[PDB]
Subunit: 208 residues, 4 copies
């Protein structure tokens, strides 16, 4: 189940990230603020738990989120741009790391780093700015669904119908949250209009 | 026009803020994150403007929020706990400051410090954790509406049906967003279950 | 006791803040980061206290700062730009607020808003980007020194010699920490090269 | 070139991190604020460059840091705890990623993931909470020095004497900035009193 968000400030953040003549500082801060918005939306169907706490007027009971039951998993590198934002929504959530890279020739993705915490029974939230062909997300899920997650959610700034197709086809139980679904993918597997080479725009030097 | 937010994460931030035995650091951080959510929600109906920018593939037109059209107005001191969260949603928004204080004997509010930028034609978003008797918000609006704002929004973590009444009776054109409408006001004008003396809990020493 | 910090990153943050064609977003972030540096430098001679804590390998004794012993006092409006960064150094410090504004004819200042926590025996750290004539700091000091604080420190991005001389002359006990001591003060009481109308550049509309 | 920092606030941040009973939220925030400090100290010798800019009073010439000429390199996953803090001092620096993992039997480190921007002629700053045996850092340097960086700096909250010795013995040109030099390494290659398993304390679950 795919879900495209329509909030005007998500569009703003997304479109603000499209602007190539912005500094890396601005891009990073924009995606972090977007990550907060995305994870916030993705957690709108979370169930709270009643717990007794202490207030200024004595003991009382209120509903709370079991922050520890949430596990964020950013795909380095771009996934990382969302992590700080995601943690602001859920400060005590665990964090898993997947080092993945797409083979620009075959368009396939491979895992070179995996440092995941105990995922069994918890709610996992994948973090990755773009969803192009879906190769990276497919390999990420493959690596994650093995630990028997309770539920897997994924957040992205933009997505290509191409990727949305396969994903929702081979991973129907996965919840996909997207800031904006773009037009298509080109001959090189880049989302159009997309964000170009965000990985390098974020932490290196963009070629555009 | 009152709107009570029902998002489970807002309820979590609010209740977390209800916890008296937390550190000032935790309270400030909690309310900063809640502020982001409250402002995010409050701008769900914001109108975007189309502008041309240079993307990685070339000049394209996308809809953007005119960040400078929004003006945040935190009521000192508590309102300040939402400022950073709000500025994350709209980084280049203008900021107005209102130094107000409630007489704990009559429960009347008075303005001691006013430093507001041009509000003429802009969307003003007032920030202040609690809306109890509505006194402080009334005085604030009284001086704000003069600048002939285009629209005035208000965000609060909690509010009492008491305050929501008068405010909506003398300022019906003002949109009031609240994380959770509490039960009532006590003998001393405090909200129940409310948050207590957050001002002192946030920057000084709580008397509870 | 005047101290002109010589750290290249402080100079950079200062000079960066001098750039007139930067967004409010960028300037606010610049100053927040500069604020962290200034307070860090201003607390280099702070005393730590031994306390027993539990580590991964059992109880142990280490030296810790008594965070609640420090009080940050931002002078609205400009001084608020330091508050966020100042709190990163000392998260649980107390926060006092002073709404002061300078009379642009006599070059003297008046306090319109004062909300301070207990200051007796505490270490007060005044926050305010500029120290021009020093009229604002003087008025702030008068108001603070009455509460008998254990020590008073002040951080500024920049300052004019005439301003410094004026403060150190009457307050030989106050420690002034400045990112850079500029050239002089023009006939209007503005520091040169200075930062211009910082308050408005930060939260409203600059006239330059 | 090794350098043990003595600033009380660094000591405080470092010692606060030793508190095993703190939430992941508190630890992450503490290390972020510490990372800022460590990097701030590490760039104290940084060289600035003169550039002409537009100020409120016209064009002027000031010294600035060429932010882009700086490259931060955290070692996953612990190194990530200093990233944001490090980026606060140099917002536009480039970011390199090194996925490393120590073998708990031989205490050897191996690089499974590498995503580095162009390091040739730049100032590289490695980020890693601890520096126990030196294996992780040694491997890292050997892939970084190959790019012929202008200079290499490294920051750590704590380091074991034996770790510092091999490093300084194999990389005399590398500047190692340490928050506090602990006592030693145990039989399992853990620093004492050390921080335990910070990687798990930060993003997963600690066994202590």
């Amino acid at each position: 189940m795919i879900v495209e968000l329509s909030h005007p400030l998500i569009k703003h953040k997304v479109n603000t990230a499209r602007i190539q003549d912005t500094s890396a500082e601005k891009l990073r801060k924009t995606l972090k603020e977007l990550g907060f918005m995305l994870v916030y939306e993705a957690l709108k169907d979370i169930l709270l738990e009643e717990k007794e706490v202490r207030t200024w007027i004595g003991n009382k009971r209120f509903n709370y989120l079991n922050e520890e039951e949430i596990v964020f998993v950013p795909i380095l590198r771009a996934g990382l741009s969302f992590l700080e934002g995601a943690l602001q929504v859920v400060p005590n959530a665990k964090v898993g790391f997947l080092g993945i890279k797409r083979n620009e020739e075959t368009l396939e993705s491979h895992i070179y780093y995996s440092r995941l915490p105990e995922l069994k029974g918890k709610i996992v939230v994948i973090l990755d700015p773009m969803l192009a062909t879906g190769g990276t997300l497919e390999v990420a899920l493959r690596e994650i669904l093995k630990h028997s997650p309770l539920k897997v959610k994924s957040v992205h700034a933009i997505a290509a119908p191409e990727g949305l197709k396969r994903i929702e086809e081979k991973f129907k139980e996965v919840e996909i949250f997207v800031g904006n679904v773009d037009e298509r993918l080109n001959d090189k597997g880049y989302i159009i209009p997309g964000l170009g080479d965000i990985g390098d725009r974020l932490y290196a030097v963009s070629v555009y």
